[PDB]
Write an enzyme that holds these catalytic residues in place. Sequence first.
Site, mmCIF file in Angstrom:
data_model
loop_
_atom_site.group_PDB
_atom_site.id
_atom_site.type_symbol
_atom_site.label_atom_id
_atom_site.label_comp_id
_atom_site.label_asym_id
_atom_site.label_seq_id
_atom_site.Cartn_x
_atom_site.Cartn_y
_atom_site.Cartn_z
ATOM 1 N N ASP A 67 -3.092 10.447 0.268
ATOM 2 C CA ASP A 67 -4.516 10.739 0.348
ATOM 3 C C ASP A 67 -5.292 9.772 1.229
ATOM 4 O OD1 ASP A 67 -6.744 12.419 -0.199
ATOM 5 O OD2 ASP A 67 -7.379 11.135 -1.875
ATOM 6 N N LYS B 138 -13.722 2.561 -13.157
ATOM 7 C CA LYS B 138 -13.547 4.006 -13.056
ATOM 8 C C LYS B 138 -13.416 4.532 -14.479
ATOM 9 C CE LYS B 138 -10.631 7.340 -10.650
ATOM 10 N NZ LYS B 138 -9.419 7.471 -9.802
ATOM 11 N N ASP C 128 -7.816 4.776 -4.973
ATOM 12 C CA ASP C 128 -7.402 6.087 -5.443
ATOM 13 C C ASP C 128 -5.926 6.390 -5.306
ATOM 14 O OD1 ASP C 128 -7.236 8.737 -6.349
ATOM 15 O OD2 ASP C 128 -9.126 9.345 -5.400
ATOM 16 N N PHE D 26 -13.718 13.682 -9.723
ATOM 17 C CA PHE D 26 -12.762 12.615 -10.026
ATOM 18 C C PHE D 26 -13.191 11.646 -11.092
ATOM 19 C CE2 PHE D 26 -14.928 8.966 -8.495
ATOM 20 C CZ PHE D 26 -15.831 9.506 -7.576
ATOM 21 N N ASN E 20 -11.338 7.009 1.183
ATOM 22 C CA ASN E 20 -10.599 6.186 0.223
ATOM 23 C C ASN E 20 -10.441 4.730 0.608
ATOM 24 O OD1 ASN E 20 -10.367 8.363 -1.381
ATOM 25 N ND2 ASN E 20 -8.204 8.742 -0.961
ATOM 26 N N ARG F 69 -16.212 9.097 -12.531
ATOM 27 C CA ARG F 69 -17.265 8.229 -12.150
ATOM 28 C C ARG F 69 -16.944 6.729 -12.157
ATOM 29 N NH1 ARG F 69 -21.286 7.510 -17.418
ATOM 30 N NH2 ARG F 69 -19.711 8.481 -18.774
ATOM 31 N N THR G 227 -6.180 15.781 1.114
ATOM 32 C CA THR G 227 -7.394 16.292 1.733
ATOM 33 C C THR G 227 -7.064 17.103 2.978
ATOM 34 O OG1 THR G 227 -8.550 14.333 0.958
ATOM 35 C CG2 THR G 227 -9.635 15.692 2.640
ATOM 36 N N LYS H 250 -7.654 8.593 4.037
ATOM 37 C CA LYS H 250 -8.865 9.129 4.650
ATOM 38 C C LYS H 250 -9.945 8.054 4.547
ATOM 39 C CE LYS H 250 -10.115 11.612 0.337
ATOM 40 N NZ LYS H 250 -10.404 12.962 -0.273
#
Lengths: 340, 19
Positions: free
Chosen positions: A156, A62, A174, A44, A161, A46, A191, A158
């Site tokens: 997403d 990011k 994210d 994804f 994140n 860095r 995911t 989880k």
Amino acid sequence: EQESVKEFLAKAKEDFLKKWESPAQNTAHLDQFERIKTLGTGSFGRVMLVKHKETGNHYAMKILDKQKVVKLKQIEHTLNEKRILQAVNFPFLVKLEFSFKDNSNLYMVMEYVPGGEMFSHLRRIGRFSEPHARFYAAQIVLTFEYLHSLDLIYRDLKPENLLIDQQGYIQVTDFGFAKRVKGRTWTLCGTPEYLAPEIILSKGYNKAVDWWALGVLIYEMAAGYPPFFADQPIQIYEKIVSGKVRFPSHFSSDLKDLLRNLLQVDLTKRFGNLKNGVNDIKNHKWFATTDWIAIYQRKVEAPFIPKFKGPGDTSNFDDYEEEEIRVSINEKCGKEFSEF
Amino acid sequence: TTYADFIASGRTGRRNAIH
Ligand SMILES: N[C@H](CNc1ncc(-c2ccc3c(c2)CC(=O)N3)s1)Cc1ccc(C(F)(F)F)cc1
């Protein structure tokens, strides 16, 4: 609180669409920030801890290599994550402070959260108590109420994140998988452990997939592990579509009832997707002691306060190998990321 | 136990999104 919530969401929608239709651009330059340390890395990109040279404020930057984004066929995903981030505004969504690009890369300067990834905390402690898990779950519920009102599906959710801030509140990160859509969509994304049955299956799905994800999250936070797992994703999808679920014996009956309602295969009866929408969840007995406005207002005392040694301390993160940030003398993918 | 099964699954670490 009903009227006030509908009222609040009204203003939120109008502020969102203004920024959404006229996104901010090139609000900073790389040389204004001093690179400090890499906070996380993977396919994804860095994320590096950086420091604004003049203000001394620390941020999580990011960095995305244009060429790589294109190779990964993530052009739209990246342009979309940045458009959304500059348009939204909620206490539990990490803010995008500045954004810009150069000959080779894209940069999103976000709020820096010293507390670390929820993932790390969860695995460290094993499992959160039901009240501890409930505190976080409440934040996600409000966050999804906000996002869904804007026709935005996260896709997403989880522990990985979610970050834990200074006051011990949750901060979502994210948006590379998010999407603004009224109705159904079909993309296979997210995911494995958190995918709703209808995402795995070829048929279309809607925002209800976020609610299923909430169920998985609550389960993992309270159990220490997800409700559906296996060696390979293929095997995980098998258990998910079967949808048969077992709960730890330490799970309260009310927790189990909420989960049966969230991890519901029949997306026609899943809480969050019924006539009473989010309120079925907000009014479920498990959330009985939850003060929704106080949670929103951040007045509730967090059950867990991450340790903190300073605004530039990275002790709650993992170690990565540092890599120089190279900027070509030639422009790469100009046409493709013109909108960034 | 389920717990024992989980720790032997090979998926206790940070999980990437599918690509
Ligand atoms: N799916 C994730 C990767 N994708 C990203 N997109 C935006 C990101 C991000 C946004 C804001 C901030 C940070 C990271 C850090 C901070 O303090 N503020 S991570 C998973 C992931 C989550 C968090 C980290 C960590 F870097 F270790 F925390 C690494 C990996």
